[PDB]
Amino acid sequence: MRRPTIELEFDRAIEPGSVPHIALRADDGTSVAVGPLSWLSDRRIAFAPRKPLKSNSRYEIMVPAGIRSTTERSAHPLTSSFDTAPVTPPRGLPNLDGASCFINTALQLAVHSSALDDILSNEAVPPAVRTLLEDYDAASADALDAQLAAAVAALRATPEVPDSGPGQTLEVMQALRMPLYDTSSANNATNNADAIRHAPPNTKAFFLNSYPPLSYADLPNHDRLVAFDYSTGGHYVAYVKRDGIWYRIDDAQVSAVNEQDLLALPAFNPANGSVSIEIAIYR
Amino acid sequence: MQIFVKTLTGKTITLEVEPSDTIENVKAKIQDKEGIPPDQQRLIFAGKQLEDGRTLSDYNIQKESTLHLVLRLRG
């Protein structure tokens, strides 16, 4: 999933030697080299990145200007973009000890975030947690269950997560060492929404600790939004986006949802006054 | 000094404090009057979250000023 085969089909017939140093580029401009170019036809090349790609990250294929056609140079660089995130539906995480939905929801948001690879190589993160996130897509049902129980115990043993009983999803994020951008600490906003719209361009995860609390409809930049937690007061649920499709994950229960559903989620429970969305993940 | 604390349930709570009182002091007072542990309260003044170890003097919270309270209940 992170070292895939990429093939590009050009409109005109391209002479070899005309095609330049093709490279993939991450969002911050970092270039990864590719291997040798395979010529499937005179208008179809195939290649793969030498070094593995970051998970849950957008990459840009650039064919630099100057691709010579058999007829003629290329005026502008040819650019295409893809994403290394999985497209299979997400998996459920059973609520084992009865009071871990805050741990389950937080892991769900972490495995769908661009910080995943940084979490997986952070030795301050408990290794049982890095094990579970590593094979989240590939593990069997019984292996995922056993790995989840190991990750819950390792998390509850850290100083950040309560040793038993319920919690808040932020506490698990602090144990994962996942850097979050606090909306209230922004230089240029006095509310949650404008703090996100005006964050530094490389910012991909937000902790909404300003006012007013935001509904899904108020979350800026729906195009690039991929995950967020939803609190009802005493329960946690994860919403994650894969292949353009939103899934609601209530612990072990995964279900597809419609955009119409998400625009009806309130910014807080009007009964107990508890905030609902505190973590927002973008790609 | 007199301040007001509005919640997302549509409910105002009035407290008597002084500009020397810490943000934790205000939360413990809120824990007594309505039963919310400070662990699970967020206080907001002018869109900005009030940090525990600070005073109301720091956030220029005068008399008459009204805070917004956001509950962060465990799940």
Side-chain angles (χ1 to χ4, degrees), chain A residues 1-2 4-10 13-42 44-50 52-67 75 77-141 143-222 225-283, chain B residues 1-5 7-62 64-75:
Chain A
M1 187 78 237
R2 290 143 55 170
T5 282
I6 295 136
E7 54 184 298
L8 321 187
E9 188 145 359
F10 300 91
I14 307 305
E15 179 169 14
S18 325
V19 83
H21 149 257
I22 300 192
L24 308 138
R25 298 208 304 165
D27 266 358
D28 62 4
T30 279
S31 303
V32 47
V34 299
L37 278 84
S38 296
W39 289 87
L40 276 39
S41 77
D42 51 80
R44 207 162 318 117
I45 57 180
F47 54 94
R50 307 188 197 182
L53 304 174
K54 268 185 65 171
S55 35
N56 299 332
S57 317
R58 297 215 157 261
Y59 281 93
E60 187 215 67
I61 297 137
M62 176 152 305
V63 197
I67 316 102
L78 280 306
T79 280
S80 178
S81 319
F82 70 101
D83 182 18
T84 66
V87 293
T88 188
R91 296 184 79 181
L93 290 180
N95 176 34
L96 290 191
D97 69 16
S100 307
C101 62
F102 75 100
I103 293 167
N104 296 335
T105 293
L107 295 168
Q108 217 64 246
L109 261 58
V111 84
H112 285 83
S113 75
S114 314
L116 179 55
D117 279 2
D118 303 302
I119 298 179
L120 301 173
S121 47
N122 189 343
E123 281 196 290
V125 173
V129 184
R130 323 199 304 261
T131 295
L132 164 79
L133 296 157
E134 182 148 336
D135 62 342
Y136 166 91
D137 283 309
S140 62
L144 195 71
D145 273 37
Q147 279 172 339
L148 178 61
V152 167
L155 280 184
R156 289 201 184 266
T158 79
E160 289 96 329
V161 170
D163 304 10
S164 51
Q168 295 144 332
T169 37
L170 171 65
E171 303 165 317
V172 179
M173 290 311 195
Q174 291 164 318
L176 301 181
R177 300 296 145 96
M178 198 210 274
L180 297 165
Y181 185 91
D182 302 324
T183 56
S184 150
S185 321
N187 64 110
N188 48 347
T190 59
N191 61 88
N192 279 314
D194 282 323
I196 301 177
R197 287 190 191 96
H198 293 156
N202 65 333
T203 310
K204 299 182 226 71
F206 295 90
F207 182 63
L208 283 77
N209 65 341
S210 198
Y211 187 80
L214 295 195
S215 66
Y216 167 85
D218 296 324
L219 284 178
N221 202 8
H222 291 260
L225 178 73
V226 297
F228 62 92
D229 66 335
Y230 189 83
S231 205
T232 51
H235 201 57
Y236 270 106
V237 153
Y239 280 96
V240 292
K241 190 184 195 183
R242 287 191 171 197
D243 202 5
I245 288 184
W246 281 104
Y247 299 83
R248 178 188 173 271
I249 308 198
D250 192 349
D251 298 329
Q253 177 254 280
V254 178
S255 53
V257 289
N258 292 308
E259 183 88 12
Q260 198 181 302
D261 297 66
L262 303 208
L263 300 132
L265 289 160
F268 59 88
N269 191 338
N272 63 6
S274 211
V275 59
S276 40
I277 314 189
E278 278 187 303
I279 316 283
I281 310 295
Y282 291 86
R283 198 181 316 302
Chain B
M1 188 177 32
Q2 210 189 33
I3 39 171
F4 303 122
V5 177
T7 76
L8 303 170
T9 61
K11 174 183 279 89
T12 297
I13 317 165
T14 89
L15 292 134
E16 267 85 23
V17 294
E18 41 205 17
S20 147
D21 290 350
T22 71
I23 290 307
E24 239 292 347
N25 264 93
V26 184
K27 288 179 173 196
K29 274 161 168 272
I30 289 188
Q31 171 178 31
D32 278 344
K33 183 139 202 104
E34 254 74 41
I36 316 135
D39 262 347
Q40 311 163 213
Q41 316 174 20
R42 186 188 294 134
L43 296 165
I44 308 292
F45 185 76
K48 268 31 181 149
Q49 172 179 283
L50 311 184
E51 297 306 312
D52 273 354
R54 299 251 167 272
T55 77
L56 301 170
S57 148
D58 305 353
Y59 294 98
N60 293 331
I61 282 161
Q62 305 263 16
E64 164 263 1
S65 266
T66 82
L67 313 190
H68 288 287
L69 165 63
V70 178
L71 260 51
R72 326 196 313 110
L73 294 165
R74 314 212 140 200

